[PDB]
Ligand binder design. Structure first.
Ligand SMILES: C[C@@H](C(=O)O)c1ccccc1
Ligand SMILES: [Ca+2]
Lengths: 206, 557
């Protein structure tokens, strides 16, 4: 059968999905996720789209504003819109899978609704590819690959130059925040190779 | 996050071993999600954060993969030129270009809704900080517009069968992440993947650049430039968020440095100590690194030189000798509250004193604050993340190395004072501080141990569970939020591959309306505590023989 999705869980509750095509495979993935971590994922969705204040209140307004100020929705949507059918099936199937379980949850809440929804006072809603993609964008991209303190660095350098003078200050900034350090233990050994690129370390853009 | 891959030349009773420990802090329910995919070209098993379509930690029976954050510099800030006479525009390439903007409304539970605008330029979203009538800063990411490509790359890589098919996917991952490879034949590999900007000549990637146009990136560097290695002659690949490669520049974070003092050495030491390691010995490294004080090895020699001419009746001498005899491996006392040895307490107090006397004294306020932390700071709940050598401590390390350090000491952190003198003075504070708190008998000192907490709030600080769902663990362990190991061609098994992981507190975070907790809600918590682990199945036969439940859905798109 091409419409079959078998879900076998192991002795630790870990699910194994079996399916013919792409859409069905990730449908089953989303389905088991909805069963295991619905409350976790819902709050993760709100954390990555900045809608926590909707259910938790005023203490999270600032958090919401900051999340929204750090990404651009049109951009994310356009990327999704550019996905080939096969790639789209990933996001679409995952969303659909979650929706199948969420529909059963809201159909029989007295037995299937995770207690946290009851405690926090709301019910879960349907997911779309955007939502699924945003989980990754927000908990991986925007949070582990979005690091910079360049403005602070310039303030430090500016202070060091005022205290020690121009050349000495520059040289001290290269002492506290060196660009590279040849004694740094590296994952790749020097016998293998080295990075060919050299960089300006005098803030010459000024 | 740490990772060590052991190739055929260093694997005992196997051809390759991979052990991964991603460190995102500890949460309940679990940071990652265990899942197995079979069909549509996928045949995989492992676990992944927030249940991404693509598994960050896993294998497919032919190869296995892992990650740790890369922390390369892939983000620059552009200083945009504004005009009061043209609200909403910025100067770029001699023209006033219209910024991108959008309205947002924050609906608030039991409160009034708030509306505001978000602005963006060709360089990136505008920061809500550092704002003037003439300037606004835009945050520029080399990975901008490639988020989905990275997600899809993390997924497609699961289907690779060799180094070439795999690197083809790593080339499409635009975030700054370390990818690792291993296979059934014993090949191992590493790629510091991601998009990195090709910068204008003279661009200091540590400081802002004008947004008027002359400083715009040339484009992105080629994949050829990404640090990578296949089957290193060392026979192993180890990483703990340290530098990928010689001469490779780190993130611009002021508190982030790749220097002579690096915690990854704690792993290289253990892997080189033994010519070959078995799966069990490789797994053991988690236990050892998670308990290893990271500063002992760095400053012990300085402490020994400074006190080498003291009599034994001087307590400062006695403190160093205590460190000399120590392996730096903390163990809990029977009270499940204190450490057997007072080493970390001694190091913490001394180090805190050293930084205040050196680095901190040379940096103008308020920036001095950035270099004062000893790296031991914590709260009752214990560290929210991994433990590391502090930025101030790394800078201090270059200083005590004297000319053995390749970093020119523009200014003497010891300000003309003999290093020994300052080191002895800090040792004096330590004895004073500690002796006054624990008595004068070091052999009976019971210093506080750090504990570990599985928090109810995700790393954003948002509740992902009820508070009551928080879990506690007596012993803090500087290890992965999850640990997984894949072993290829194990000689004691009938399978070409064996794998293990531990997803604590458990696979499920489900609680029924009446409060009935799922059977797999907490069945991996004790296992995490004692460095235990459970098998990951892949083959249909294995999954079948270990089945607990089944279900078959029938649906068409
Ligand atoms: C936990 C985090 C890190 O290394 O800091 C991370 C990010 C991406 C992949 C693995 C680990
Ligand atoms: Ca930068």
């Amino acid at each position: 059968s091409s419409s079959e999705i078998k879900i076998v869980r192991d002795e630790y509750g870990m699910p194994h999905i079996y399916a013919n095509d792409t859409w069905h495979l990730f449908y089953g993935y989303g389905y088991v996720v909805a069963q295991d971590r619905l409350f976790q994922m819902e709050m993760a969705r709100r954390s990555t789209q900045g809608t926590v204040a909707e259910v938790l209140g005023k203490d999270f307004v600032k958090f919401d504003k900051d999340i929204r100020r750090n990404y651009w929705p049109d951009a994310i949507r356009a990327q999704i819109a550019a996905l080939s059918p096969e790639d789209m099936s990933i996001l679409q199937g995952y969303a659909d899978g979650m929706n199948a379980w969420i529909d059963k949850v809201n159909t029989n809440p007295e037995t299937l609704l995770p207690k946290q929804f009851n405690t926090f006072g709301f019910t879960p809603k349907r997911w779309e590819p955007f939502d699924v993609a945003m989980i990754f964008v927000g908990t991986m991209a925007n949070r582990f690959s979005d690091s910079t303190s360049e403005i602070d660095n310039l303030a430090l350098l500016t202070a060091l130059k005022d205290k020690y003078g121009v050349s000495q200050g520059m040289a001290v900034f290269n002492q506290l925040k060196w660009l590279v350090n040849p004694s740094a233990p590296t994952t790749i050994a020097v016998q293998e190779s080295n990075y060919p690129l050299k960089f300006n370390q005098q803030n010459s853009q000024t | 996050s740490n990772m060590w891959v052991i190739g055929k030349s260093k694997a005992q009773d196997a051809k390759a071993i991979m052990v991964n420990g991603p460190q995102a802090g500890w949460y309940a329910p679990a940071y990652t999600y265990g899942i197995g995919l079979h069909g549509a070209g996928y045949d995989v098993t492992g676990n992944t954060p927030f249940a991404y379509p693509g598994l960050v930690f896993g294998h497919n029976g032919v190869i296995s993969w892992g990650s740790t954050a890369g922390f390369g510099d892939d983000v620059d800030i552009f200083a945009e030129r504004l005009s009061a006479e043209k609200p909403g525009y910025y100067l770029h390439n001699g023209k006033w270009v219209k910024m991108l903007s959008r309205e947002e409304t924050i609906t608030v539970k039991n409160g009034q809704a708030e509306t505001f605008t978000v602005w963006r330029t060709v360089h990136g979203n505008i920061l809500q900080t550092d704002q003037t009538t003439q300037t606004a800063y835009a945050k520029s990411r080399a990975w901008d517009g490639k988020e989905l490509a990275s997600l899809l790359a993390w997924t497609h890589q699961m289907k690779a069968k060799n180094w070439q098919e795999w690197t083809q996917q790593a080339a499409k991952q635009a975030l700054t992440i370390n990818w690792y490879y291993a296979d059934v034949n014993g090949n191992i590999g590493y790629v510091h993947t991601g998009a990195y900007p090709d910068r204008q000549s003279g661009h200091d990637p540590r400081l802002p650049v004008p947004g008027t146009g002359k400083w715009d990136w040339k484009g992105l560097l080629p994949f050829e430039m990404n640090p990578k290695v296949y089957n290193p002659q060392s026979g192993y690949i180890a990483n703990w968020n340290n530098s990928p490669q010689k001469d490779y520049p780190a993130s611009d974070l002021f508190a982030f440095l790749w220097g002579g003092a690096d915690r990854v050495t704690e792993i290289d030491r253990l892997l080189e100590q033994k010519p070959r390691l078995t799966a069990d010995q490789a797994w053991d490294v988690i236990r050892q690194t998670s308990r290893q004080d990271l500063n002992l090895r760095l400053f012990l020699p300085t402490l020994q030189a400074a006190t080498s001419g003291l009599t034994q009746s001087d307590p400062r001498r006695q403190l160093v000798e205590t460190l000399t005899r120590w392996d730096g491996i903390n163990l809990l006392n029977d009270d499940g509250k204190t450490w057997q040895q007072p080493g970390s307490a001694i190091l913490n107090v001394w180090l805190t004193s050293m930084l205040k006397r050196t680095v901190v004294a040379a940096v103008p306020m308020p920036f001095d604050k950035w270099y004062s932390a000893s790296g031991y700071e914590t709260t009752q709940d214990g560290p929210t993340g991994s433990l590391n050598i502090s930025v101030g401590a790394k800078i201090l390390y270059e200083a005590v190395q004297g000319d053995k350090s390749p970093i020119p000491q523009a200014v003497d952190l010891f300000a003309g004072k003999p290093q020994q003198e300052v080191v002895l003075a800090a040792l004096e504070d330590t004895w004073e501080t500690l002796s006054k708190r624990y008595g004068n008998n070091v052999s009976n000192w019971k210093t506080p141990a750090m504990a570990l907490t599985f928090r109810a709030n995700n790393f954003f600080g948002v509740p992902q569970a009820a508070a009551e769902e928080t879990r506690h663990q007596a012993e803090y362990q500087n290890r992965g939020t999850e640990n997984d190991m894949i072993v290829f061609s194990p000689t004691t098994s009938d399978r070409p591959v064996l794998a293990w992981d531990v997803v604590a507190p458990g696979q499920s975070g489900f609680i029924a309306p009446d409060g009935t907790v799922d059977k797999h809600y907490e069945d991996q918590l004790k296992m995490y505590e004692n460095f235990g682990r459970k098998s990951l199945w892949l083959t249909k036969q294995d999954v079948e023989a270990h089945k607990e439940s089944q279900e078959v859905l029938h649906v068409q798109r």
